[PDB]
Design a protein around this ligand. Structure first.
Ligand SMILES: NC(=O)c1ccc[n+]([C@@H]2O[C@H](COP(=O)([O-])OP(=O)(O)OC[C@H]3O[C@@H](n4cnc5c(N)ncnc54)[C@H](O)[C@@H]3O)[C@@H](O)[C@H]2O)c1
Ligand SMILES: NC(=O)c1ccc[n+]([C@@H]2O[C@H](COP(=O)([O-])OP(=O)(O)OC[C@H]3O[C@@H](n4cnc5c(N)ncnc54)[C@H](O)[C@@H]3O)[C@@H](O)[C@H]2O)c1
Ligand SMILES: NC(=O)c1ccc[n+]([C@@H]2O[C@H](COP(=O)([O-])OP(=O)(O)OC[C@H]3O[C@@H](n4cnc5c(N)ncnc54)[C@H](O)[C@@H]3O)[C@@H](O)[C@H]2O)c1
Ligand SMILES: NC(=O)c1ccc[n+]([C@@H]2O[C@H](COP(=O)([O-])OP(=O)(O)OC[C@H]3O[C@@H](n4cnc5c(N)ncnc54)[C@H](O)[C@@H]3O)[C@@H](O)[C@H]2O)c1
Lengths: 334, 335, 335, 335
């Protein structure tokens, strides 16, 4: 079992722990947690969840300790990641989930503190490698010390872009992800570095940026420079969607698009790529641990070569699950 | 000299047709009757207080079966069958059919049986003598078109942008996703519905849904027939929608060319119908904007010189309700 | 052994009764029939997928006009009027009336003609042989009671608190405001309605509304007649409500006494029906909780010894649906 | 004779103080200085476009470090510590403290150190020389009060109602729950916060919370010291709030007497401050209403002559921001 610490006990941080517990997985153990508050507040935030419900197991608090079923977890409050006791606690991997230490050189402070590897829960400027689990995690080597788990959007688009490109070919494509609001937006209109993201989150559709599409051109090099995209933030607390229109290299059909996703889903990317043949809506994919769930009924083909698809993602649950798969795979190279 | 009109179905659009006439100060049209399914006071109450547009900017006087908003009594009805209305007596030039239940052309045609001289449907109308997007094809109206359709809110958003961009650089093929506000045909909580998507609690999810608006551009621009398709996604906002469009241009172009061609038209031929913003705005800033379509310059992308994406906002209540009036006035002149 | 039940109207109430029976594992009641006028496939889809309660955790097999949730086919019918139902053929012990259309005793009782032996209406029911809050006046049911009301979500939340506190300290006078989640009978957007309050966009406002729950407690608990009044305020949430009650005690008391009296009730006589929390929880934390009433200790207030304020949550869907079954099990024993 | 003001903290309240001034046309006050934490152009952009109040009605023009709203350049700063703001230089009569971050007398008074002659805190302030609800106790101001509090939005709503009733029929004892719109100090999603309630996602729940507004009346109105207690529940609306008050009268009363004592104050000495409605309105209807408190008449109830419940609405943003200017004008005359 690889030893991990969670830095930033937030939406991703807490859910990383929750997914581990809810699965019984034994390949990974969380040994410490760090945020900026009382141990008790961390425990209470874990216990009660406005999106996913109540925590399924008792949550025990002992001094500086948290226990969720398998022994106490050392809990901290250290602003500077380089001051953490990673050596003394023998941390194989630091999972960096604050939002503020995403460049390689900052994420690396965990290495200074004593962790052997670092995984940033987001795009990472200067990452030794950027990973979409199930797609390119076999590129990890003994070389990479500080890597990125990509963004929730990249983890949803890449598996779909990969299969379809392998099947039918992608000449050129444009993505708009319609995303649930997120903690880096305000409840009401207020001073912000980004004028779109300044705006009341549950009140509008809000145009926003995202490197997800170009980023896929890097986790799948064969799609270098062929995809571009943006986002629209809307009034939902959790769950998002990818709406991608692209040109196929050869003429195709709705059926062939659908079928190719099904075979991939039931075979090589099982658990990572999924699909529904039903008429579902966003909330239906709440608490689904797939990176991507392809909406069969939404496939469109215009004039042989123009293709539209829709794929869902639980931006919290799916991604937090991958943070674990990625860590277990990274620990094995140590 | 003003066209005499009657609103059938005093819902989100029937109310805002009236309200927009009043806010705009327009003298060319006049509402002379209103019909719905309830007491006069209830209708007045819903005109007075709006959850999305706010309070009615003027007093609303009720006296009998009548409503006064500044200019004299408006006769108010409560008749389920459209065939039974006193359109001939009250001298209705044009009935505006807004219930959402008489969009069929022979169903709309009941307003002529009842006495109106012409009919406009506030939606796509199957079998309409003509379908119109004001500013794009109101020129094709003739003295013979008797029961026309004002298209949909989404169609009035898309067609003016398609027309400009096609005239200027050429559209080969494209796909539309409208992210649209939820509407009165969806429920609060999940429940029995003919469409499995729309059965779902409306303010709780992103809800993919069906729409023929892109294909319908083909009805107002034959040049464009068969070249556009699209769908919708409804989201938890109560008003204001947006067209997100990715298409293949006939020649290489650039972000700048596209925005530019849009400004030119917005500032000239299509002033008031197609507008644009160069600022970083979000959907609520367009609440109560009367444009059919407001192009969002910043969001314009171009990939490999010929794949082009655009984003254009509409107030689905407000623009569309304003255009209902523009269309009735034009039609009125041909009577 | 298990009481055999039929659900009339597979709207939300009806579906959640089923889901609650299945999720709990209980063995004392069984749904053997459903009657509804919409399509069997749509009803299965709505059982499978809930936007408030989430994914139903068992397989749902459609096989013709039948549905199987894990114990055999459940016949689904469509029969306009409840006297025409084949309740005799089907061996129904109790029809659960959940349409919202058949609430009066004489209407609900058509099910008795249709062949069933008892009827339970899932709301207040005019002229009911008895009105039940399970856990409170559960024991006043007889062999002679043939058509009953399971009262309302708010009443099942209030009566248990009122009873404990009245027994312990005494209630002279009180006023209840229930801050309630919006519900299926409110519209998405402003529109024609009998009640002008309920005409307003449901998720855009705090909306004042009347409720009969405080009167109704004076009936379940006769010693409290004329003692309690109240009203509601609907707010933009899809599920979970709360009772905010302020009353005058018969005698001086304290915060700790009030809370302590609730805990001893919840941990004994009223287990599973009235619960409490000693933590700082919010409304979503009670989503999908089967209690009728969950007392919020932290929110208890006393001033000048005798004016008391309390706060108690209810999942207005899930608690009430469980009680439907608890009530029916008991009714069955009297058959 | 126009009081010169600086707005420190250009947030919901800050921006709307400026907006109410422009909109009213009033000429007794002049904003001469704005301070926040970001670029001039960002401050201007948040003034231009407002998700709750809509677009700014006048042009918002930027030149260098100044914005101009129709009446000449307002100087714009970005300075974190208030002791450094050039208040002396710029002849500031009254610094309006609106950051939420300097509410205690010693932090608020840093503005006096900087050059301002007076300070009004836009919230409860520990140690304030006086706490003012305009319309109620502003006659109590003296030339001697240097640092003052304008109370809370809730106290400005409750105090006028409490005054009228108390003066008319007496208040022995009351309890208050305010149902309140979420504000900027709550998160979009569950996250670390110093208060375990307010840590929870803001638009997802009914969230019980702490307020001193009921006690604080007790000291705009000494006759009422120690007689009222209260608490809050935040719910998923972005603006507009309500007071739900239940109290013991000093004598027997009626629904009718309670209501017309309010009408009379509202139409007489409390005009513009306390208003009322006789109609069936909902929260959104009071968006952008400048009253401090608008009494909802149909909601008055009386239990056994002496138990009285009432409901009164407040736009927590728009009403309070207007009062800030009113209070500023009064204070300025005493300098
Ligand atoms: N929420 C999502 O949908 C999602 C999905 C994919 C990726 N991500 C990425 O994951 C990261 C976190 O996202 P989130 O949604 O969990 O945000 P969040 O705000 O919920 O979590 C951030 C947490 O870090 C804590 N924190 C701040 N500074 C700290 C410090 N110096 N030391 C320790 N803790 C500190 C905060 O208290 C907070 O609890 C971001 O980079 C985000 O982009 C988020
Ligand atoms: N809401 C929009 O953004 C929008 C935009 C463009 C077009 N439209 C179209 O306009 C039409 C109405 O839309 P809406 O949002 O105003 O719906 P709505 O539900 O708000 O309005 C329908 C109104 O008609 C009344 N009505 C129903 N049956 C009637 C009958 N038998 N006789 C008289 N009145 C009757 C109802 O009471 C209701 O007030 C629909 O066809 C819709 O597709 C709507
Ligand atoms: N939902 C709650 O929290 C709750 C709580 C307490 C009491 N109640 C009461 O329970 C009743 C139902 O509530 P609900 O929320 O389930 O409403 P709902 O709208 O979800 O359910 C109504 C269902 O009955 C069906 N129906 C309507 N007319 C019918 C008829 N003619 N024949 C057969 N089926 C018909 C509809 O298709 C729908 O599925 C109401 O009286 C309500 O007051 C509900
Ligand atoms: N929003 C309401 O309904 C309301 C009502 C009545 C009273 N109040 C009180 O008014 C105050 C502000 O409320 P708000 O809703 O406008 O909050 P807000 O967050 O919307 O506004 C606060 C503003 O102050 C700025 N700021 C923070 N630190 C600063 C500093 N060091 N120097 C200068 N500016 C700084 C922030 O950038 C922000 O623009 C609070 O005390 C609040 O309790 C608010």
């Amino acid at each position: 079992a690889v030893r991990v610490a969670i830095n930033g006990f937030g939406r991703i941080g807490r859910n990383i722990l929750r997914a581990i517990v809810e699965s019984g997985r034994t390949d990974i153990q969380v040994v410490a947690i760090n945020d900026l508050g009382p141990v008790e507040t961390n425990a209470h935030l874990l216990r009660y969840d406005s999106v996913h419900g109540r925590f399924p197991k008792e949550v025990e608090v002992a001094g500086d300790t948290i226990d969720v079923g398998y022994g106490p977890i050392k809990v901290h409050a250290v602003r500077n990641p380089a001051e953490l006791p990673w050596k003394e606690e023998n941390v194989d991997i630091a999972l960096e989930c604050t939002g503020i230490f995403t460049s390689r050189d900052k994420a690396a402070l965990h290495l200074e503190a004593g962790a052997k590897r670092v995984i940033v829960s987001a795009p990472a400027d200067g990452a030794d490698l950027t990973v979409v689990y199930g797609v390119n995690n076999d590129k990890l080597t003994k070389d990479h010390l500080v890597i990125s788990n990509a963004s929730c959007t990249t983890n949803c688009l890449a598996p779909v872009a990969q299969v379809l490109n392998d099947t039918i070919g992608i000449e050129k494509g444009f993505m708009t992800t319609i995303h649930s609001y997120t903690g880096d937006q305000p409840t009401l209109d207020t001073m912000h570095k980004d004028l779109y993201r300044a705006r009341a989150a549950a009140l509008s559709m809000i145009p926003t940026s995202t490197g997800a599409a170009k980023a896929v051109g890097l986790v799948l090099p064969e799609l270098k420079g062929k995809l571009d995209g943006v986002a629209i933030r809307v009034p939902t607390p959790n769950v998002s969607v990818v709406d991608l229109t692209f040109i196929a290299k050869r003429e195709t059909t709705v059926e062939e698009v659908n079928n190719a996703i099904r075979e991939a889903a039931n075979g090589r990317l099982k658990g990572i790529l999924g699909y529904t043949d039903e008429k579902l809506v966003s909330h239906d994919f709440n608490h689904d641990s797939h990176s991507s769930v392809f909406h069969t009924d939404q496939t469109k083909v215009m004039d042989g070569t123009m293709v539209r698809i829709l794929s869902w993602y639980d931006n919290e649950w799916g991604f937090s699950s991958r943070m674990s798969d990625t860590a277990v795979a990274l620990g094995k190279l140590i």
